Amino acid sequence: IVGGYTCGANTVPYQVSLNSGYHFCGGSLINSQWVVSAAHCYKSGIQVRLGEDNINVVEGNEQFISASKSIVHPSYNSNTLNNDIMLIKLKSAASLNSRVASISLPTSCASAGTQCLISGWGNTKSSGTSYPDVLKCLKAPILSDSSCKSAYPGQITSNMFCAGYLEGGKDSCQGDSGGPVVCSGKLQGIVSWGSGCAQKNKPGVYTKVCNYVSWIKQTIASN
Ligand SMILES: NC1=NCc2ccccc21
Ligand SMILES: [Ca+2]
């Protein structure tokens, strides 16, 4: 997250870190046994880490649970990033509490202008690299479809939305992929892609979770 703020320990209780020896992506806990992330985060050997604040320190509220299975969306295209969503099942259910909690799926798609909370452990620099270790947060509005398409001609599908600031300075970044965009207490987006980080006229692009609620629910119900 570039241009954000330190969230505060365990203030984003649905935020998970995906670890394969190291943090490589975020995710969102949507029930005691399932995490939503980005399809481009897929790999084998995933451990889901819940209750994290500093991802390099065991502070006392963590739960580390290996994945039993991953399900990439059947229509994910890794070239276009269309349908950049996957589900990860935990081998055992997390113990839910005030610091490890699921985030509701949306009932409706959120509109341009709605404020959202974007969070992650990704790079905090638009030039160069620095990783923050504690969770960073950014409040940002959803942008209109027309301004998203104008920013990224030929690249925005009906399964994507932009959020952030056309002036730049505040955005998600590498290492935030797969993490949450929460608006009005519902998971509306997944951190997906952008051209650089926090650059002018290149806002962040997010998977449009409301298009996937039926797939998520049906997949969980049978897996
Ligand atoms: N918003 C983003 N700009 C670059 C990037 C990489 C990975 C995830 C999100 C972004
Ligand atoms: Ca920790």
Tell whether ligand 1 has an atom less than 6 A from the beta carbon of residue 84. no
For residues 140-152, one letter each, b for 16 or more C-beta atoms within 10 angstroms of the residue's C-beta and e for the rest, the string is bbbbeeeebbebb
Give CA–CA dist 142/63, Å, rounded: 32
Q: What is the CATH number of the domain that holds 79?
A: 2.40.10.10
Judge contact between 113 and 184, C-beta under 8 A.
no
To which residue do tokens 């939305």 refer?
Answer: 161
- Note down the domain range covering 87: 15-103+212-222
Judge contact between 161 and 205, C-beta under 8 A.
yes
Give CA–CA dist 46/51, Å, rounded: 16
Tell whether ligand 1 has an atom less than 6 A from the beta carbon of residue 172. yes
Helix (H, G, I), strand (E, B) or coil at 143: coil
What is the rounded (10 degree) CA torsion for 19, 22, 24, 27?
Answer: 30
95 labelled catalytic: no
Token pair recorded at residue 202: 């290149």
Helix (H, G, I), strand (E, B) or coil at 219: helix
For residues 23-49, one letter each, b for 16 or more C-beta atoms within 10 angstroms of the residue's C-beta and e for the rest, the string is bbbbbbbbeebbbbbbbbbbeeebebb
Ligand 1 centre to CA of 136 (Å) is: 14
User: Pick from 18, 170, 145: which is nearest to 89 by CA?
Assistant: 18
Choice among 84, 102, 119, 176 that is catalytic = 84
* Ligand in closest contact with the CA of 63: 2
Tell whether ligand 1 has an atom less than 6 A from the beta carbon of residue 194. yes
Is 72 flagged in the annotation as binding? no
Token pair recorded at residue 52: 């994290």
> Please, what sign has the CA dihedral across residues 57, 18, 16, 141?
positive
Ligand 2 centre to CA of 58 (Å) is: 4
Q: Strand (E) positions, 160-214?
A: 160-163, 180-183, 186-193, 204-208
User: What was the resolution (in A) of this experimentally determined structure?
Assistant: 1.0
Judge contact between 139 and 64, C-beta under 8 A.
no
What technique determined this structure? X-ray
73 labelled catalytic: no
Amino acid at 178: G
Amino acid at 197: C
Beta strand 186-193 with 204-208 is antiparallel
Give CA–CA dist 178/193, Å, rounded: 10
H-only helix segments in the chain:
145-151, 213-221
Beta strand 86-90 with 186-193 is unpaired
Helix (H, G, I), strand (E, B) or coil at 218: helix
Judge contact between 89 and 33, C-beta under 8 A.
yes
